[PDB]
RNA sequence: UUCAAAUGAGAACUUUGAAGACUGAAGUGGGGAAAGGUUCCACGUCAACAGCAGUUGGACGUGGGUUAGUCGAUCCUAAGA
RNA sequence: AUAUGGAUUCUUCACGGUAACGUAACUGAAUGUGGAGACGUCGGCGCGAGCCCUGGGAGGAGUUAUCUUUUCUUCUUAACAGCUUAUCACCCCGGAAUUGGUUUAUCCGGAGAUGGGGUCUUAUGGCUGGAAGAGGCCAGCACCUUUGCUGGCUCCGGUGCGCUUGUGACGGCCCGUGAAAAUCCACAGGAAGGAAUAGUUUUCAUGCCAGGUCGUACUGAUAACCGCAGCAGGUCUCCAAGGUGAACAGCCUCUAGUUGAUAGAAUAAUGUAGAUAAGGGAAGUCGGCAAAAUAGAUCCGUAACUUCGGGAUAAGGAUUGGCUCUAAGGGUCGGACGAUCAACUUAGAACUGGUACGGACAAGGGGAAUCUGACUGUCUAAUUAAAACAUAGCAUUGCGAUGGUCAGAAAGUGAUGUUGACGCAAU
């Protein structure tokens, strides 16, 4: 997941099983004040949902990650 | 001698799972899934194929312009010219016979 | 309709070490190049000149770089020079022998 | 199979999480008599019956 | 994915307000039976389509490069 | 099936190289439908299991991995329910 | 969601072509009509794609005592888009017996052939854009390094009863004539809506926004499924190279994949599996059980009987290698004959040998009669494949719907029946 942050400009999150792509995009924009290019989601084998969130070119995912608290 | 595989989950040779073999810019053979061939529209009266009408699957006619789907004549994309000719001759002669 | 084609072979590196004889190498091509059949039919069609540093072959007959490389490799094996001398191509129809 | 319903996949996810050893720190609790997980499952020995 | 053979319509595309980028490609190809010549391609990135203009004369190519709008992002090679 | 090297307390069986062979395109090749359910991948690792062996494994321990407006489901109707 | 450009309008809802019909556009409600969706199987023929085979050239590798301008290998082009491209069909002109045209396969023409000139479907192919900037093959330089840089080439052809597959026009077959619906389009119709200082078309072009939910790893089997198991069993399907040959047969090889199944030593008896035998040739045995013999192809020759179709590969004979030659069988091109190019098919003749030659592989034993069932077909999964069952044919029986046969506890309930005696039902 960390490789996709620095290289792909993509943030990886664990999200609730009831949330769709519209709600994930809305939540990220207000929680982290960023613009979202697109969202890809999958259901992991352990029963949780993982979302690949790619930010627009105006934002850098690495700067968001270290501001959130994880590097 | 390169061998190919299906690119979908269907493993059987049905009408919707037909393939063609093409060579890619990468220099290898790869299967290409092909859609079923279209059928020409037929005349309403005699059943023969209509001249000047595009041949497409039913849903594709909504994307093309009207000039591809009709002929500049009465019953253009419905009846062929010969059947339209028969209709006009029959209509005139029968109505004249009615007066007499 | 048969414009002449020039093949240049550079032997500068092997002759510097002295384990190569450009004069003998050019003479081998004289008695081994086949033209429209067997050896010895060079009826002013194939010429192999020499200046002491390069080998020039100009031919108006069936000749190719692959054939030139084929004959050169035969000469190197005869004198047991395959382990040191390599026939390499630099540009189109221009070659050299690498000593390494 | 690769094609599976959501219910089947959810059922398989729970069975994966239940197939793990017992933590060691639990064995040192007062009045503890549990030694090994008696409901351990291997994919090639006992089938889920699904 | 689309080719244009008219210079007049090419300049109209460069000011269509939805075009922001363009590229110039130089090709070294052989003609029928003569000396090699340099071939240039002008590619305009539209919203829906890519338009390519190809001209084989280097004299007219230089003029067209200069006449491109100064506010258009032009990528050389 | 054979030779040598590497690894190891330990090598007929692990790894690499070399040699000799086989499947011979209706294959011991390359993909899938059912069915299985993490067996996939890496690291650690050999008490039990692989009816000899074992440093190896579909074993054991700890983690990682499945991204779709265009592929399917979803829609339609068939015998039927 | 919406704007601009274009088109159209003062003759309000476009023009051209004799016509087939053409186009960047070019008002169309209710209602109606038609088309697409939408369809069996087999046979040969035409064409396309990939593969196979092959020539020249530009690179790399292998062999090189000797020979081989040699052996192997790289030389590729997606969806989509523009222009163009077709058998069939159709249009105009013309008016046919001295009947012509024409398919491998005999059909077509005064209900208008042949011929001349046109129109159309775009399966498919060609050129260009996509696109060489990619991918592939090499060379010359830096270097623990985060790993790179600079260069060239990536071209032009031939061939076909080839293989696989797609497709077109046809032909054979039925007491068998070989789904439905969602959905999309056209036409008929003419309700309304509409211009002159102004409107309309989002079926023409360009531009803006959005596209949720669930599945997606891996095995797919002599170890990931089922058989108590890492069981020689069972389990649906796609892709398919070279040689030999009729061949998806057997046998050998390339790509790719495996080299797994407890081992070492020895070679008694008895076994299991594979084999060979002097002379005799079924004397063995319930019984030729088992095994042997026969075997491909070409030529010659072939009886009784028969439902005339068969019997038939009846029976019975001959030939087959290698090498060097000869003869016949074609396409195209400028107008009476030449030039040039490219297929394996058959027949024949010399020469040659330890008389061998379908040299391994592959591969029918045959004949004279009796019992029985007509034939093809079918059953006792795990001891019986048969003469048993079925079958076409033949005959009998019931019934005209308020009915025959049959089902149900009942029913405002069912099967035959989307049926009607050339039918249904029962033997
Ligand atoms: Cl799975
Ligand atoms: Cl024995
Ligand atoms: Cl009988
Ligand atoms: Mg998904
Ligand atoms: Mg389907
Ligand atoms: Mg396990
Ligand atoms: Mg199992
Ligand atoms: Mg074998
Ligand atoms: Mg073999
Ligand atoms: Mg593994
Ligand atoms: Mg053991
Ligand atoms: Mg052990
Ligand atoms: Mg475990
Ligand atoms: Mg997968
Ligand atoms: Mg089971
Ligand atoms: Mg069981
Ligand atoms: Mg053959
Ligand atoms: Mg004997
Ligand atoms: Mg004897
Ligand atoms: Mg006897
Ligand atoms: Mg006796
Ligand atoms: Mg027998
Ligand atoms: Mg019988
Ligand atoms: Mg039969
Ligand atoms: Mg039985
Ligand atoms: Mg039996
Ligand atoms: Mg009977
Ligand atoms: Mg009924
Ligand atoms: Zn008609």
Polypeptide structure, described:
This is part of a larger assembly, with chains A (71 residues), B (100 residues), C (100 residues), D (50 residues) and E (77 residues). By secondary structure, chain B is α+β, with helices and mostly antiparallel strands. Chain B is 19% helix and 10% strand. Chain B has a two-stranded antiparallel ribbon. In chain B, β1 and β2 form a beta hairpin. The relative contact order of chain B is 0.12. With 100 residues, chain C is α+β, with helices and mostly antiparallel strands. Chain C has one domain (3-100). Chain C has helices at 12-17, 22-30, 65-78; strands spanning 5-10, 46-50, 54-59, 86-91, 94-98. In chain C, a hairpin with a 2-residue loop joins β4 (86-91) and β5. With 50 residues, chain D is mainly α. Chain D has one helix at residues 6-17. The radius of gyration of chain D is 15 Å and the shape is elongated. The chains are: A alpha+beta (71), B alpha+beta (100), C alpha+beta (100), D mainly alpha (50), E alpha/beta (77). Chains in contact: A-D. The interface between A and D is small, with 4 and 7 residues. The structure holds 2 RNA strands. It is classed as ribosome. Keywords: RPL39, ribosomal protein, ribosome.
How does the SSE layout of this entry go?
The structure is cut from a larger assembly and holds chains A (71 residues), B (100 residues), C (100 residues), D (50 residues) and E (77 residues).
Chain C (H helix, E strand, L loop, with lengths): L4 E6 L1 H6 L4 H9 L15 E5 L3 E6 L5 H14 L7 E6 L2 E5 L2
Parallel strand pairs in C: 1-5
Antiparallel strand pairs in C: 1-3, 2-3, 4-5
Chain D lengths: L5 H12 L33
Chain E lengths: L1 E2 L3 H7 L7 E9 L7 E9 L4 E6 L2 H10 L5 E4 L1
Parallel strand pairs in E: 1-4, 2-5
Antiparallel strand pairs in E: 2-3, 3-4
Bound molecules: chloride ion (3 copies), magnesium ion (MG) (25 copies) and zinc ion.
Chain B binds 2 RNA strands through strand 1 and strand 2.
